Amino acid sequence: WSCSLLVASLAGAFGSSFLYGYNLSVVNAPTPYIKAFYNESWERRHGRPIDPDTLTLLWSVTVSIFAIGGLVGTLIVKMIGKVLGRKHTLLANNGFAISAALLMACSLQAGAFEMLIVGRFIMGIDGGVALSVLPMYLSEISPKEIRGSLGQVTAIFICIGVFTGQLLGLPELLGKESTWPYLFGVIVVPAVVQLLSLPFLPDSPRYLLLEKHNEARAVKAFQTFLGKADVSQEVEEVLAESRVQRSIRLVSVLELLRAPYVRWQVVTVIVTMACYQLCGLNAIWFYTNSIFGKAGIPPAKIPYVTLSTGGIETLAAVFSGLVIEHLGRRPLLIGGFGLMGLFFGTLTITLTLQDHAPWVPYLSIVGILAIIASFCSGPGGIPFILTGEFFQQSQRPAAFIIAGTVNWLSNFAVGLLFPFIQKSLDTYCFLVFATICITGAIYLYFVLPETKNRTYAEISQAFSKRNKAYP
Ligand SMILES: *[C@@H]1O[C@H](CO)[C@@H](O[C@@H]2O[C@H](CO)[C@@H](O)[C@H](O)[C@H]2NC(C)=O)[C@H](O)[C@H]1NC(C)=O
Protein backbone atom coordinates (compact mmCIF):
# COMPACT_ATOMS: atom_id res chain seq x y z
CA TRP A 1 0.00 0.00 0.00
CA SER A 2 1.45 3.30 -1.23
CA CYS A 3 0.28 6.60 0.28
CA SER A 4 -2.15 7.76 -2.44
CA LEU A 5 -3.83 4.32 -2.68
CA LEU A 6 -4.96 4.59 0.98
CA VAL A 7 -6.39 8.12 0.69
CA ALA A 8 -8.13 7.19 -2.63
CA SER A 9 -9.65 4.08 -0.99
CA LEU A 10 -10.67 5.76 2.31
CA ALA A 11 -11.95 9.13 0.97
CA GLY A 12 -13.45 7.33 -2.04
CA ALA A 13 -15.45 4.96 0.20
CA PHE A 14 -16.28 7.39 3.08
CA GLY A 15 -18.08 9.89 0.82
CA SER A 16 -19.77 7.22 -1.35
CA SER A 17 -20.47 3.69 -0.09
CA PHE A 18 -20.56 4.69 3.59
CA LEU A 19 -23.31 7.23 2.73
CA TYR A 20 -25.32 4.51 0.96
CA GLY A 21 -25.05 2.36 4.10
CA TYR A 22 -25.84 5.28 6.45
CA ASN A 23 -28.97 6.12 4.43
CA LEU A 24 -30.39 2.59 4.96
CA SER A 25 -30.37 2.82 8.76
CA VAL A 26 -30.65 6.59 9.49
CA VAL A 27 -34.38 6.41 8.72
CA ASN A 28 -35.14 3.85 11.51
CA ALA A 29 -34.53 5.68 14.84
CA PRO A 30 -36.36 9.04 14.06
CA THR A 31 -39.50 7.18 12.80
CA PRO A 32 -41.87 8.29 15.68
CA TYR A 33 -40.69 11.93 15.43
CA ILE A 34 -41.07 12.07 11.62
CA LYS A 35 -44.58 10.51 11.73
CA ALA A 36 -45.62 13.04 14.41
CA PHE A 37 -44.34 15.78 12.05
CA TYR A 38 -46.32 14.39 9.06
CA ASN A 39 -49.49 14.15 11.19
CA GLU A 40 -49.20 17.70 12.59
CA SER A 41 -48.38 19.03 9.07
CA TRP A 42 -51.36 17.30 7.44
CA GLU A 43 -54.07 18.42 9.89
CA ARG A 44 -52.70 22.01 9.90
CA ARG A 45 -52.82 22.15 6.05
CA HIS A 46 -56.03 20.20 5.24
CA GLY A 47 -58.11 21.01 8.35
CA ARG A 48 -58.98 17.31 8.95
CA PRO A 49 -56.96 14.66 10.92
CA ILE A 50 -54.77 12.13 9.08
CA ASP A 51 -55.97 8.49 9.11
CA PRO A 52 -53.57 5.62 10.08
CA ASP A 53 -53.32 4.10 6.57
CA THR A 54 -52.45 7.44 4.89
CA LEU A 55 -49.73 8.07 7.50
CA THR A 56 -48.39 4.50 7.02
CA LEU A 57 -48.24 5.04 3.24
CA LEU A 58 -46.44 8.44 3.53
CA TRP A 59 -43.83 6.82 5.77
CA SER A 60 -43.48 3.79 3.43
CA VAL A 61 -42.97 6.20 0.48
CA THR A 62 -40.43 8.29 2.46
CA VAL A 63 -38.41 5.14 3.30
CA SER A 64 -38.57 3.45 -0.13
CA ILE A 65 -38.37 6.41 -2.63
CA PHE A 66 -34.58 6.21 -2.05
CA ALA A 67 -34.55 3.00 -4.17
CA ILE A 68 -36.24 4.79 -7.12
CA GLY A 69 -33.51 7.40 -6.66
CA GLY A 70 -30.86 4.67 -6.83
CA LEU A 71 -32.36 3.33 -10.09
CA VAL A 72 -32.18 6.82 -11.67
CA GLY A 73 -28.58 7.14 -10.40
CA THR A 74 -27.69 3.71 -11.92
CA LEU A 75 -28.98 4.92 -15.33
CA ILE A 76 -27.43 8.44 -15.18
CA VAL A 77 -23.92 6.83 -15.10
CA LYS A 78 -24.57 5.44 -18.64
CA MET A 79 -25.38 8.96 -19.95
CA ILE A 80 -22.37 10.57 -18.17
CA GLY A 81 -19.98 7.78 -19.30
CA LYS A 82 -16.91 9.08 -21.22
CA VAL A 83 -17.61 12.80 -20.46
CA LEU A 84 -16.31 13.32 -16.86
CA GLY A 85 -14.11 10.35 -15.93
CA ARG A 86 -14.17 8.37 -12.68
CA LYS A 87 -12.80 10.94 -10.19
CA HIS A 88 -14.85 13.93 -11.42
CA THR A 89 -18.04 11.82 -11.39
CA LEU A 90 -17.39 11.06 -7.67
CA LEU A 91 -16.62 14.76 -6.97
CA ALA A 92 -19.72 16.00 -8.88
CA ASN A 93 -21.87 13.40 -7.06
CA ASN A 94 -21.54 15.46 -3.84
CA GLY A 95 -23.96 17.97 -5.41
CA PHE A 96 -26.68 15.39 -4.63
CA ALA A 97 -25.38 14.50 -1.13
CA ILE A 98 -25.20 18.13 0.05
CA SER A 99 -28.49 19.23 -1.60
CA ALA A 100 -30.38 16.21 -0.21
CA ALA A 101 -28.85 16.67 3.27
CA LEU A 102 -30.05 20.32 3.28
CA LEU A 103 -33.55 19.47 1.93
CA MET A 104 -34.07 16.78 4.58
CA ALA A 105 -32.59 18.76 7.51
CA CYS A 106 -34.54 21.98 6.81
CA SER A 107 -37.84 20.15 6.14
CA LEU A 108 -39.06 20.64 9.73
CA GLN A 109 -38.34 24.41 9.73
CA ALA A 110 -40.04 24.85 6.33
CA GLY A 111 -43.02 22.91 7.74
CA ALA A 112 -43.39 20.82 4.56
CA PHE A 113 -43.17 17.01 4.49
CA GLU A 114 -42.62 16.98 0.70
CA MET A 115 -39.05 18.25 1.24
CA LEU A 116 -38.20 15.07 3.19
CA ILE A 117 -39.64 12.79 0.45
CA VAL A 118 -37.82 14.79 -2.30
CA GLY A 119 -34.62 14.75 -0.19
CA ARG A 120 -34.71 10.94 0.18
CA PHE A 121 -35.08 10.72 -3.62
CA ILE A 122 -32.00 12.87 -4.45
CA MET A 123 -29.95 11.03 -1.79
CA GLY A 124 -31.02 7.88 -3.70
CA ILE A 125 -29.59 9.23 -6.98
CA ASP A 126 -26.32 9.86 -5.09
CA GLY A 127 -26.26 6.27 -3.80
CA GLY A 128 -26.89 4.95 -7.35
CA VAL A 129 -23.98 6.91 -8.88
CA ALA A 130 -21.72 6.16 -5.86
CA LEU A 131 -22.15 2.36 -6.13
CA SER A 132 -21.71 2.29 -9.94
CA VAL A 133 -18.53 4.43 -10.18
CA LEU A 134 -16.63 3.59 -6.95
CA PRO A 135 -15.97 -0.10 -7.96
CA MET A 136 -14.71 1.18 -11.35
CA TYR A 137 -12.37 3.76 -9.73
CA LEU A 138 -10.97 1.38 -7.05
CA SER A 139 -10.34 -1.53 -9.46
CA GLU A 140 -8.70 0.81 -12.04
CA ILE A 141 -6.20 2.56 -9.68
CA SER A 142 -5.10 -0.58 -7.81
CA PRO A 143 -2.18 -3.02 -8.30
CA LYS A 144 -3.05 -6.19 -10.25
CA GLU A 145 -2.53 -8.36 -7.14
CA ILE A 146 -5.21 -6.76 -4.92
CA ARG A 147 -8.15 -6.07 -7.33
CA GLY A 148 -9.78 -9.18 -5.77
CA SER A 149 -9.84 -7.69 -2.23
CA LEU A 150 -11.55 -4.42 -3.14
CA GLY A 151 -14.99 -5.90 -3.86
CA GLN A 152 -14.98 -6.51 -0.09
CA VAL A 153 -13.81 -2.96 0.81
CA THR A 154 -16.95 -1.44 -0.80
CA ALA A 155 -19.00 -4.04 1.17
CA ILE A 156 -17.36 -3.36 4.57
CA PHE A 157 -17.85 0.42 4.28
CA ILE A 158 -21.60 -0.08 3.64
CA CYS A 159 -21.76 -2.04 6.93
CA ILE A 160 -19.77 0.62 8.85
CA GLY A 161 -22.41 2.92 7.30
CA VAL A 162 -25.46 1.01 8.62
CA PHE A 163 -23.76 0.71 12.03
CA THR A 164 -22.99 4.47 12.22
CA GLY A 165 -26.61 5.33 11.31
CA GLN A 166 -27.73 3.09 14.21
CA LEU A 167 -25.09 4.57 16.56
CA LEU A 168 -26.01 8.28 15.97
CA GLY A 169 -29.71 7.32 16.32
CA LEU A 170 -29.19 6.34 20.02
CA PRO A 171 -31.17 8.66 22.38
CA GLU A 172 -27.87 9.74 24.01
CA LEU A 173 -26.59 11.14 20.67
CA LEU A 174 -28.92 12.58 17.96
CA GLY A 175 -32.06 10.36 18.12
CA LYS A 176 -33.98 12.75 20.42
CA GLU A 177 -37.20 14.65 19.62
CA SER A 178 -35.38 18.04 19.56
CA THR A 179 -32.39 16.90 17.42
CA TRP A 180 -33.70 14.42 14.83
CA PRO A 181 -33.09 16.89 11.88
CA TYR A 182 -29.32 16.67 12.48
CA LEU A 183 -29.42 12.91 11.66
CA PHE A 184 -29.93 14.03 8.03
CA GLY A 185 -27.92 17.26 8.36
CA VAL A 186 -24.72 15.35 9.39
CA ILE A 187 -24.58 13.77 5.88
CA VAL A 188 -22.78 17.01 4.85
CA VAL A 189 -19.61 15.82 6.69
CA PRO A 190 -18.81 12.69 4.51
CA ALA A 191 -19.46 14.83 1.42
CA VAL A 192 -17.17 17.70 2.56
CA VAL A 193 -14.37 15.29 3.66
CA GLN A 194 -14.47 13.79 0.14
CA LEU A 195 -14.59 17.18 -1.68
CA LEU A 196 -11.55 18.39 0.32
CA SER A 197 -9.41 15.26 -0.34
CA LEU A 198 -10.19 13.71 -3.77
CA PRO A 199 -9.11 16.80 -5.85
CA PHE A 200 -5.46 16.31 -4.76
CA LEU A 201 -5.28 12.70 -6.06
CA PRO A 202 -4.73 11.57 -9.70
CA ASP A 203 -7.60 10.57 -11.99
CA SER A 204 -7.87 6.88 -12.97
CA PRO A 205 -4.80 5.88 -15.07
CA ARG A 206 -6.95 3.89 -17.54
CA TYR A 207 -9.40 6.74 -18.21
CA LEU A 208 -6.43 9.09 -18.73
CA LEU A 209 -4.91 6.63 -21.23
CA LEU A 210 -7.89 5.17 -23.17
CA GLU A 211 -10.66 7.79 -22.92
CA LYS A 212 -8.66 11.06 -22.46
CA HIS A 213 -5.79 10.02 -24.85
CA ASN A 214 -3.17 11.57 -22.51
CA GLU A 215 -0.37 9.01 -22.07
CA ALA A 216 1.95 11.33 -20.09
CA ARG A 217 -0.69 11.85 -17.35
CA ALA A 218 -1.54 8.11 -17.34
CA VAL A 219 2.15 7.29 -16.71
CA LYS A 220 2.28 9.88 -13.88
CA ALA A 221 -0.89 8.42 -12.30
CA PHE A 222 0.46 4.83 -12.47
CA GLN A 223 3.78 6.08 -10.99
CA THR A 224 1.85 7.79 -8.14
CA PHE A 225 -0.58 4.97 -7.24
CA LEU A 226 1.79 1.97 -7.68
CA GLY A 227 4.77 3.81 -6.12
CA LYS A 228 7.38 2.78 -8.74
CA ALA A 229 9.21 4.37 -11.70
CA ASP A 230 9.10 1.73 -14.49
CA VAL A 231 5.34 1.39 -15.08
CA SER A 232 5.91 0.35 -18.74
CA GLN A 233 4.25 -3.06 -18.29
CA GLU A 234 1.16 -1.45 -16.68
CA VAL A 235 0.51 0.89 -19.63
CA GLU A 236 0.96 -1.85 -22.26
CA GLU A 237 -1.42 -4.23 -20.40
CA VAL A 238 -4.19 -1.57 -20.52
CA LEU A 239 -3.53 -0.73 -24.20
CA ALA A 240 -3.59 -4.48 -25.01
CA GLU A 241 -6.95 -5.04 -23.27
CA SER A 242 -8.37 -2.00 -25.12
CA ARG A 243 -7.07 -3.28 -28.51
CA VAL A 244 -9.03 -6.49 -27.70
CA GLN A 245 -12.22 -4.70 -26.49
CA ARG A 246 -12.31 -2.36 -29.56
CA SER A 247 -12.97 -5.47 -31.72
CA ILE A 248 -16.21 -6.32 -29.83
CA ARG A 249 -19.78 -5.21 -30.64
CA LEU A 250 -21.96 -5.05 -27.50
CA VAL A 251 -25.23 -7.00 -27.15
CA SER A 252 -28.07 -4.56 -26.36
CA VAL A 253 -30.38 -5.06 -23.33
CA LEU A 254 -33.51 -6.00 -25.32
CA GLU A 255 -31.40 -8.30 -27.56
CA LEU A 256 -29.94 -10.08 -24.48
CA LEU A 257 -33.52 -10.63 -23.18
CA ARG A 258 -34.70 -11.98 -26.57
CA ALA A 259 -31.70 -14.28 -27.30
CA PRO A 260 -32.62 -17.96 -26.55
CA TYR A 261 -28.97 -19.10 -26.26
CA VAL A 262 -28.70 -17.19 -22.92
CA ARG A 263 -32.28 -17.65 -21.61
CA TRP A 264 -31.55 -19.52 -18.34
CA GLN A 265 -28.56 -17.24 -17.57
CA VAL A 266 -30.88 -14.21 -17.79
CA VAL A 267 -33.62 -15.95 -15.75
CA THR A 268 -31.05 -17.06 -13.09
CA VAL A 269 -29.82 -13.44 -12.75
CA ILE A 270 -33.37 -12.04 -12.43
CA VAL A 271 -34.40 -14.71 -9.85
CA THR A 272 -31.18 -14.30 -7.80
CA MET A 273 -31.28 -10.46 -7.77
CA ALA A 274 -34.98 -10.58 -6.81
CA CYS A 275 -34.40 -13.02 -3.89
CA TYR A 276 -31.33 -11.03 -2.74
CA GLN A 277 -33.66 -8.07 -2.00
CA LEU A 278 -37.08 -9.74 -1.51
CA CYS A 279 -35.55 -11.92 1.26
CA GLY A 280 -36.38 -8.76 3.28
CA LEU A 281 -32.96 -7.97 4.79
CA ASN A 282 -33.47 -4.27 3.96
CA ALA A 283 -36.76 -4.37 5.92
CA ILE A 284 -34.49 -5.17 8.91
CA TRP A 285 -32.50 -1.91 8.38
CA PHE A 286 -35.45 0.40 7.55
CA TYR A 287 -37.79 -0.95 10.26
CA THR A 288 -35.71 -2.54 13.06
CA ASN A 289 -37.12 -0.69 16.10
CA SER A 290 -40.72 -1.58 15.10
CA ILE A 291 -39.79 -5.27 14.65
CA PHE A 292 -38.15 -5.43 18.11
CA GLY A 293 -41.14 -3.53 19.56
CA LYS A 294 -43.62 -6.15 18.26
CA ALA A 295 -41.22 -8.89 19.46
CA GLY A 296 -41.75 -7.70 23.06
CA ILE A 297 -38.30 -6.24 23.81
CA PRO A 298 -38.81 -3.62 26.64
CA PRO A 299 -39.30 -0.10 25.12
CA ALA A 300 -36.21 1.40 26.86
CA LYS A 301 -33.83 -1.33 25.58
CA ILE A 302 -34.71 -1.26 21.88
CA PRO A 303 -32.24 1.50 20.67
CA TYR A 304 -29.27 -0.39 22.23
CA VAL A 305 -30.50 -3.87 21.15
CA THR A 306 -30.86 -2.64 17.53
CA LEU A 307 -27.19 -1.50 17.58
CA SER A 308 -26.17 -5.19 17.65
CA THR A 309 -27.68 -5.73 14.17
CA GLY A 310 -25.19 -3.38 12.42
CA GLY A 311 -22.45 -4.86 14.64
CA ILE A 312 -22.99 -8.49 13.55
CA GLU A 313 -23.40 -7.36 9.92
CA THR A 314 -19.96 -5.66 10.09
CA LEU A 315 -18.38 -8.75 11.74
CA ALA A 316 -19.89 -11.05 9.10
CA ALA A 317 -18.82 -8.72 6.24
CA VAL A 318 -15.16 -8.72 7.44
CA PHE A 319 -14.95 -12.55 7.45
CA SER A 320 -17.06 -12.83 4.23
CA GLY A 321 -13.87 -13.08 2.14
CA LEU A 322 -12.68 -16.20 4.04
CA VAL A 323 -15.88 -18.15 3.28
CA ILE A 324 -16.32 -17.25 -0.42
CA GLU A 325 -12.80 -18.52 -1.28
CA HIS A 326 -13.40 -21.92 0.39
CA LEU A 327 -16.91 -23.25 -0.33
CA GLY A 328 -17.58 -22.19 -3.93
CA ARG A 329 -20.66 -20.40 -5.24
CA ARG A 330 -23.34 -23.12 -5.39
CA PRO A 331 -23.42 -24.37 -1.70
CA LEU A 332 -22.93 -20.82 -0.32
CA LEU A 333 -25.85 -19.37 -2.30
CA ILE A 334 -28.23 -22.33 -1.76
CA GLY A 335 -27.27 -22.84 1.90
CA GLY A 336 -27.38 -19.05 2.46
CA PHE A 337 -31.02 -18.60 1.36
CA GLY A 338 -31.84 -22.03 2.82
CA LEU A 339 -30.66 -20.96 6.31
CA MET A 340 -32.40 -17.56 6.21
CA GLY A 341 -35.63 -19.41 5.36
CA LEU A 342 -35.10 -21.55 8.50
CA PHE A 343 -34.40 -18.57 10.81
CA PHE A 344 -37.44 -16.60 9.51
CA GLY A 345 -39.27 -19.81 10.54
CA THR A 346 -38.01 -19.83 14.15
CA LEU A 347 -38.35 -16.03 14.37
CA THR A 348 -42.08 -16.50 13.52
CA ILE A 349 -42.39 -19.08 16.35
CA THR A 350 -40.65 -16.89 18.96
CA LEU A 351 -42.72 -13.82 17.97
CA THR A 352 -45.94 -15.90 18.28
CA LEU A 353 -45.16 -17.59 21.62
CA GLN A 354 -43.58 -14.40 23.08
CA ASP A 355 -46.08 -14.40 25.98
CA HIS A 356 -45.28 -17.94 27.24
CA ALA A 357 -42.09 -17.09 29.15
CA PRO A 358 -40.12 -13.83 29.74
CA TRP A 359 -36.92 -15.07 28.04
CA VAL A 360 -38.67 -15.80 24.71
CA PRO A 361 -38.42 -12.23 23.20
CA TYR A 362 -34.61 -12.40 23.53
CA LEU A 363 -34.59 -15.51 21.28
CA SER A 364 -35.97 -13.23 18.53
CA ILE A 365 -32.75 -11.16 18.86
CA VAL A 366 -30.67 -14.34 18.26
CA GLY A 367 -33.10 -15.13 15.40
CA ILE A 368 -32.62 -11.74 13.69
CA LEU A 369 -28.82 -11.89 14.20
CA ALA A 370 -28.63 -15.42 12.68
CA ILE A 371 -30.47 -14.07 9.59
CA ILE A 372 -27.95 -11.19 9.24
CA ALA A 373 -24.96 -13.54 9.74
CA SER A 374 -26.39 -16.09 7.23
CA PHE A 375 -26.80 -13.42 4.52
CA CYS A 376 -23.38 -11.71 4.89
CA SER A 377 -21.39 -14.98 5.10
CA GLY A 378 -22.73 -16.04 1.67
CA PRO A 379 -25.54 -14.41 -0.43
CA GLY A 380 -24.27 -10.89 0.41
CA GLY A 381 -21.52 -11.03 -2.27
CA ILE A 382 -22.13 -13.90 -4.71
CA PRO A 383 -24.97 -12.54 -7.00
CA PHE A 384 -22.66 -9.89 -8.55
CA ILE A 385 -19.88 -12.51 -8.93
CA LEU A 386 -22.26 -14.89 -10.79
CA THR A 387 -23.48 -12.12 -13.15
CA GLY A 388 -19.84 -11.82 -14.31
CA GLU A 389 -19.15 -15.58 -14.57
CA PHE A 390 -22.27 -16.31 -16.71
CA PHE A 391 -21.71 -13.85 -19.60
CA GLN A 392 -19.08 -12.91 -22.24
CA GLN A 393 -17.39 -9.48 -22.31
CA SER A 394 -19.79 -8.43 -25.13
CA GLN A 395 -22.88 -9.38 -23.06
CA ARG A 396 -21.68 -8.30 -19.61
CA PRO A 397 -22.57 -4.54 -19.91
CA ALA A 398 -26.21 -5.39 -20.71
CA ALA A 399 -26.46 -8.16 -18.08
CA PHE A 400 -25.61 -5.68 -15.29
CA ILE A 401 -28.34 -3.25 -16.48
CA ILE A 402 -30.91 -6.08 -16.10
CA ALA A 403 -29.40 -7.20 -12.77
CA GLY A 404 -29.23 -3.60 -11.43
CA THR A 405 -32.78 -2.71 -12.53
CA VAL A 406 -34.23 -5.83 -10.83
CA ASN A 407 -32.17 -5.04 -7.69
CA TRP A 408 -33.49 -1.48 -7.17
CA LEU A 409 -37.12 -2.30 -8.12
CA SER A 410 -37.07 -5.14 -5.55
CA ASN A 411 -35.57 -2.93 -2.82
CA PHE A 412 -38.36 -0.39 -3.49
CA ALA A 413 -41.10 -3.07 -3.12
CA VAL A 414 -39.73 -4.34 0.23
CA GLY A 415 -39.33 -0.79 1.60
CA LEU A 416 -42.86 0.16 0.46
CA LEU A 417 -44.91 -2.95 1.34
CA PHE A 418 -43.36 -4.27 4.61
CA PRO A 419 -45.46 -1.98 6.95
CA PHE A 420 -48.64 -3.30 5.26
CA ILE A 421 -47.53 -6.94 5.57
CA GLN A 422 -46.89 -6.27 9.31
CA LYS A 423 -50.38 -4.74 9.57
CA SER A 424 -52.14 -7.61 7.75
CA LEU A 425 -50.38 -10.81 8.90
CA ASP A 426 -49.40 -9.36 12.31
CA THR A 427 -47.04 -11.92 13.88
CA TYR A 428 -46.73 -14.15 10.76
CA CYS A 429 -45.27 -11.35 8.58
CA PHE A 430 -41.91 -13.15 8.30
CA LEU A 431 -43.46 -16.27 6.68
CA VAL A 432 -43.50 -14.16 3.48
CA PHE A 433 -39.69 -13.85 3.54
CA ALA A 434 -39.33 -17.51 4.60
CA THR A 435 -41.37 -18.49 1.51
CA ILE A 436 -39.25 -16.28 -0.79
CA CYS A 437 -35.92 -17.56 0.64
CA ILE A 438 -36.95 -21.22 0.33
CA THR A 439 -38.46 -20.72 -3.17
CA GLY A 440 -35.23 -19.01 -4.27
CA ALA A 441 -33.06 -21.75 -2.71
CA ILE A 442 -35.05 -24.58 -4.36
CA TYR A 443 -34.77 -22.86 -7.78
CA LEU A 444 -30.96 -22.49 -7.47
CA TYR A 445 -30.57 -26.13 -6.34
CA PHE A 446 -32.12 -27.34 -9.65
CA VAL A 447 -30.83 -24.73 -12.17
CA LEU A 448 -27.51 -23.20 -11.01
CA PRO A 449 -24.32 -24.96 -12.33
CA GLU A 450 -21.11 -24.98 -10.29
CA THR A 451 -18.94 -22.04 -11.43
CA LYS A 452 -15.96 -22.00 -9.01
CA ASN A 453 -12.64 -22.48 -10.91
CA ARG A 454 -14.57 -23.09 -14.18
CA THR A 455 -14.42 -21.49 -17.64
CA TYR A 456 -17.17 -19.81 -19.71
CA ALA A 457 -16.78 -22.71 -22.18
CA GLU A 458 -17.88 -25.19 -19.44
CA ILE A 459 -20.51 -23.04 -17.67
CA SER A 460 -22.31 -22.15 -20.93
CA GLN A 461 -22.25 -25.85 -21.90
CA ALA A 462 -23.83 -26.72 -18.50
CA PHE A 463 -26.72 -24.28 -19.18
CA SER A 464 -27.03 -25.49 -22.82
CA LYS A 465 -28.97 -28.61 -21.70
CA ARG A 466 -32.01 -26.39 -20.91
CA ASN A 467 -31.45 -23.43 -23.30
CA LYS A 468 -31.71 -26.03 -26.14
CA ALA A 469 -29.96 -23.46 -28.39
CA TYR A 470 -26.48 -22.13 -29.32
CA PRO A 471 -25.06 -18.76 -30.57
C1 LIG B 1 -52.19 12.26 15.00
O1 LIG B 1 -51.88 13.03 16.16
C2 LIG B 1 -52.91 13.05 17.17
C3 LIG B 1 -52.43 14.01 18.25
O2 LIG B 1 -51.25 13.55 18.91
C4 LIG B 1 -53.14 11.63 17.67
O3 LIG B 1 -54.18 11.62 18.67
C5 LIG B 1 -54.00 10.97 19.89
O4 LIG B 1 -54.09 9.56 19.70
C6 LIG B 1 -53.88 8.78 20.90
C7 LIG B 1 -53.91 7.31 20.50
O5 LIG B 1 -55.11 6.95 19.80
C8 LIG B 1 -54.94 9.13 21.95
O6 LIG B 1 -54.67 8.44 23.17
C9 LIG B 1 -54.91 10.63 22.21
O7 LIG B 1 -55.93 10.99 23.15
C10 LIG B 1 -55.05 11.42 20.91
N1 LIG B 1 -55.02 12.85 21.18
C11 LIG B 1 -55.81 13.74 20.57
C12 LIG B 1 -55.57 15.18 20.92
O8 LIG B 1 -56.69 13.41 19.78
C13 LIG B 1 -53.54 10.74 16.50
O9 LIG B 1 -53.72 9.40 16.92
C14 LIG B 1 -52.52 10.82 15.36
N2 LIG B 1 -52.99 10.08 14.20
C15 LIG B 1 -52.40 8.98 13.71
C16 LIG B 1 -53.10 8.32 12.55
O10 LIG B 1 -51.35 8.54 14.17
Swiss-Prot record:
Short name of one Pfam family: Sugar_tr
Q: What is the effect of changing P361R?
A: In RHUC2; uncertain significance; according to PubMed:18701466 the variant results in decreased urate uptake, however according to PubMed:22132964 and PubMed:29967582 urate transport activity is not affected; no effect on Vmax for urate uptake; no effect on affinity for urate; no effect on protein expression; no effect on localization to plasma membrane; no effect on glucose transport
Q: Impact of mutating N282S?
A: In RHUC2; decreased urate uptake; increased Km for urate; no effect on protein expression; no effect on glucose transport
- Topological domains, Cytoplasmic: 78-89, 142-149, 202-265, 325-330, 386-400
The impact of changing T74M is:
In RHUC2; markedly reduced urate transport activity; decreased protein expression; decreased urate uptake; no effect on glucose transport
* One GO location term (cellular component): apical plasma membrane
Annotated phenotype, changing C159T: Decreased fructose transport. Higher affinity and lower transport capacity for urate
Q: Which PROSITE patterns match?
A: MFS (PS50850), SUGAR_TRANSPORT_1 (PS00216), SUGAR_TRANSPORT_2 (PS00217)
Locate the transmembrane regions by residue number. 1-21, 57-77, 90-110, 121-141, 150-170, 181-201, 266-286, 304-324, 331-351, 365-385, 401-421, 428-448
Cross-referenced CDD domains? MFS_GLUT_Class2
Disulfide-bonded cysteine pairs: these are none
Modification type Phosphoserine: residues: S464
Extracellular-side positions: 22-56, 111-120, 171-180, 287-303, 352-364, 422-427
Catalyzed reactions: urate(out) = urate(in)
Q: Which InterPro entries match?
A: GLUT, MFS_dom, MFS_sugar_transport-like, MFS_trans_sf, Sugar/inositol_transpt, Sugar_transporter_CS
Tell me what happens on changing C376A: No effect on fructose transport. Higher affinity and lower transport capacity for urate
One GO term of the biological process aspect: dehydroascorbic acid transport
> Known consequence of changing V231I?
No effect on urate transport activity
Q: Which disease is it linked to?
A: Hypouricemia renal 2: A disorder characterized by impaired uric acid reabsorption at the apical membrane of proximal renal tubule cells, and high urinary urate excretion. Patients often appear asymptomatic, but may be subject to exercise-induced acute renal failure, chronic renal dysfunction and nephrolithiasis.
Matching NCBIfam families: SP
Q: Which family does it belong to?
A: Belongs to the major facilitator superfamily. Sugar transporter (TC 2.A.1.1) family. Glucose transporter subfamily.
Q: What is this protein called?
A: Solute carrier family 2, facilitated glucose transporter member 9
* Native species: Homo sapiens
Gene from which this protein is expressed: SLC2A9
